[PDB]
A paper describes a structure:
EcFrmR is a member of the CsoR/RcnR family of transcriptional repressors. Therefore, the in vivo and in vitro data showed that EcFrmR is a repressor of frmRAB expression that responds directly to formaldehyde by disassociation of the Pfrm–EcFrmR complex, allowing the expression of the formaldehyde detoxification system.
Each subunit consists of three helices (α1, residues 2–30; α2, residues 35–68; and α3, residues 73–91), linked by two short loops (L1, residues 31–34; and L2, residues 69–72), that are arranged as a flattened S-shape. One face of the tetramer (A/B face) is comprised of an unmodified homodimer with electron density visible for residues Lys9-Lys91 of both polypeptides with a disordered N-terminal region (residues Pro2-Lys8). In contrast to the A/B face, clear electron density is present for residues Pro2-Lys8 of both subunits on the A′/B′ face, resulting in an ordered extension to the N-terminal region of α1.
Residue numbers in the entry:
A (entry chain C), C (entry chain D): 2 to 91
B (entry chain B), D (entry chain A): 9 to 91
Write the structure that this text describes.
Amino acid sequence: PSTPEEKKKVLTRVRRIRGQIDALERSLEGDAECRAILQQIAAVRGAANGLMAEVLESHIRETFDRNDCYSREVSQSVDDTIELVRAYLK
Amino acid sequence: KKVLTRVRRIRGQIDALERSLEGDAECRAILQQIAAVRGAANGLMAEVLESHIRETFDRNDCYSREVSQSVDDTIELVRAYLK
Amino acid sequence: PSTPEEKKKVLTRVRRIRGQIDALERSLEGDAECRAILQQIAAVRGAANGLMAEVLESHIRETFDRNDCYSREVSQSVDDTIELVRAYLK
Amino acid sequence: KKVLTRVRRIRGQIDALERSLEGDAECRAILQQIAAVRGAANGLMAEVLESHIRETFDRNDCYSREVSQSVDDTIELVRAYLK
């Protein structure tokens, strides 16, 4: 993030991830079944990966823009690149 | 246990990332740290799995040098895949 | 596998994986799109994982049996364990 | 184009696995080798993505040291996640 607007959304998501980690401690200290925990942990990893893709997409786009290089073909390269990352970096 | 040890390290990573963001760090650094959170979610999953597996086979009243390896190799395999 | 029957099923699956690696090789010899290649590689990995579970499950089962220790609860534990491995080792 | 480099070495692992089985190796050893097949496929994926990412951002006629690093950093993540 470079824009203060991007700073805000990421902080939101990051906080929401601390929100998911709270419920995991809450569940760990309590009466949780390993299958419910593993699921909570998996959703943490899902959330991180979600955000990683959103930061990456945003970073790549800003790089091309500072370089006066943003066009529709560049923009779609990024679309293509992020679909792959979303699908294969887990 | 060794599990909460890891839940804190995760919380540790998220608060630093929350602060990286507050302290306006460079984008490479934000990505570096989100990837590291994911890596620790995998490491934590490798503990909780290791717990449930260790615990499920002591529970079955089958002790043996041979059964212990079988359970070490299962754990070694989990560790390879999740690190 | 210790059993001469289980050696055969596994050896099929391994060959079926060679068959997938040859199709992948065809697709790099000739030219298919870069997303169809990724999909092929993921399918190889899905096949390896798939077999890693089948072998793991059989190995654990044999260990309890060989120790005169096989019951239904031991059997369902292995069911519970493999379902997790299938779901979380990728 | 060092994709064949790896597709070969992966075929190398499958045949050794086929030998292990024909040659009555330990059940522990089969699992070790199947995990390494999976590990190789991930490495293969980390090359094929690297090919595509590089190829896709040179094709945009946008050169600059700052753009090169953004692409290095992308490729670093790809490597971190897959090995």
